[PDB]
Design a protein around this nucleic acid. Sequence first.
DNA 1: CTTAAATATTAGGTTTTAATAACATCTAGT
DNA 2: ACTAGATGTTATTAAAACCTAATATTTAAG
Lengths: 393, 386
Amino acid sequence: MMELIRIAMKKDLENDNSLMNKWATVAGLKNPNPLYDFLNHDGKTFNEFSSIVNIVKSQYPDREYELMKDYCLNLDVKTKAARSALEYADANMFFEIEDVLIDSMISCSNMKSKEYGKVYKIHRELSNSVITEFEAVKRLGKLNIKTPEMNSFSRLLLLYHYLSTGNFSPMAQLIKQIDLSEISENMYIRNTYQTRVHVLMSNIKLNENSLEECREYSKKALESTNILRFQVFSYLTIGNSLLFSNYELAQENFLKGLSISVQNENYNMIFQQALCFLNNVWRKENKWINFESDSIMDLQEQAHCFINFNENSKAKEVLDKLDLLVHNDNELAMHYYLKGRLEQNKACFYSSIEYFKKSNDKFLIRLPLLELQKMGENQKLLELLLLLEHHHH
Amino acid sequence: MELIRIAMKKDLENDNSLMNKWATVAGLKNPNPLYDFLNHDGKTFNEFSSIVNIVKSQYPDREYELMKDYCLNLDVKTKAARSALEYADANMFFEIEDVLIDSMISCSNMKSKEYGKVYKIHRELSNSVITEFEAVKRLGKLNIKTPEMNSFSRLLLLYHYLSTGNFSPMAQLIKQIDLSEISENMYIRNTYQTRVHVLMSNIKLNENSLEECREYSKKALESTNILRFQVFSYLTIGNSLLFSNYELAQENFLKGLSISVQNENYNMIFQQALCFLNNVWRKENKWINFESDSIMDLQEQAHCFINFNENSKAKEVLDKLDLLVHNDNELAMHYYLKGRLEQNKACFYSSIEYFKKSNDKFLIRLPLLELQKMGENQKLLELLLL
DNA sequence: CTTAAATATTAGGTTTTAATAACATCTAGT
DNA sequence: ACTAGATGTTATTAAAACCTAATATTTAAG
């Protein structure tokens, strides 16, 4: 079988012979002779996976998934190339590629490939709550990990668990034991894990309330990667670190995330909601509100446009719609915050804080608090509910 | 020839009635095994409680002396040694436990090897020699076979989850424990059952489920004759009451004091708990310690003086405390005392600050109560308790 | 004090699993 | 294409976990 990327490159090369020298620079090669091999010989892989990733990202950016899915799924799993494809798929959250590779690699006869798949299955199972952190780290001990790559990914997938649930305390200690410099086989994996650490470092500094460091680590992330997923969330993170303090710089960062995600439905919508919510927080005319949606979040942000602009009747219509819907803890907290501003009623604001606490939200909880501050309450106490790290001597 | 055997021989010569009584204490149908125990070096009982309950009944004031001699002489390749292990940890007899560990880790018995190795992980983990990631990784590589150690691997994590104060994944991890899967070693089963009650009480403590917390502490007290679990069950029940019911609180602290009379450390804990309880409730305080210059005892002098309007005498104490190294939890108290003494709300805000900096959802009531006295929004400082 | 039945413990012999390295393949670049 | 260098496979050995047999020890009735 010939892979789509090889068919593509053959056709493009026929219509443009200058491509071979240019692909060879994109691929890190000293001259393009491996690139003949690659096109003509089934099974030919390059020593590092970034050679085919950067060629795909440069010649066919709009088709990366289609070609990489076809490429990875015909890789012999016993090879370094395919180990590389596992991290590739996980990093971009291509779970249909990731999980097919994993099950092939777990029963394959190559000890490295088996080890890679096996800890990667653990990370999927843990992050889908099919097993427990306790069960998962046990299986990690039981595998008797040999490769530096999985040594480092075993601590990474835990940090990805701590982050999801919420337990931020031991992360700064756990991540500091990661030592990527011990990796010597797979520079693709090393360089992505380096991006991964930057992102994790960024989020840790976010919750330690060290926002300028948060922004530096996300900057380091962006400079370290060409992977949309990581780029997307570094801009998200940066903007959130600025959402309540610097309107124009947060909007600048959200728009940059919006621009690079025009073609990705999930990622474009994330920045749409963020811009909408940003502009509501700052009481601005809001081009981002979605009047054709009956989700809770979209509906909530309408009530916010309205309450912001003294359209009190029209905000009542939306909250009446909301009253009929399945609210969870964090969504009710927003409800109460909205109901509070509409009825100017401190008691809602209190319930708002209450359900933000219950849903362990140290971020949107600024909304009820600011409102109470504008109504004569004791700012010193309001600060203590938003329990921010203070950095004393 | 072990001391406890010697003591038993002598007391038997002077009271021949003891053989039948020891046998019921030990759960034997008849005391013929007790003869063997006295006549033959190396005789052990099917169940470790037999000798523990005897020792507790006839020699309650020499339990450490006699059990240390008895354990440290067992054959570590044996179920009496395994039992002796848990016994050692459960009473916090670390000099017994640790010696037992080094010898079972390299002994030829597969089962003792396994026990010794998961208790090494537990000591190392709780002494901060390894991390919990490293610890759990090793429990995986042991490929634990015995139900006993399957249960204790979850337990030693739950204690670390306590010491640090991760507190949250506790309630799902402890539910995974299934003590009924233990068939070999009933002593270990029953003390692990006490352990779970104790842990369940502390879980329900940090969910402010105080009536359930007192229930689990109760079930612990009924399930055990180990002074450790009894001391901390009574302390736990008092603290659960310390801000709502002065009398029932004191009654539990007093009860804890009476069983701890011969133990220096357990006695101090209860003197300090009574001292702080009465300072909380602004009573005359017969439990102050005027010779101790520890931060905690000095703090409570300041607290008593402030209670009784001797502000000048409490400033003398606070000046002495001003030049001693405070951690976050200690500093919180200091800001509490300074705020009461000075009638200064900013000191209370700071105290709430340093109370949340050590994740103390207990003693933080002190500043919150003072600000409610001073006119602040009760709905607001209700929220500070979450 | 014996001792038989039940329970624990130790060992002999087996299968699995894992570490070593000798051999073979594949890659990059002349 | 073909060579050095870097990776993959396989043959050979150690080993370590794993049962089933035998041996010891415990309880409680003689």
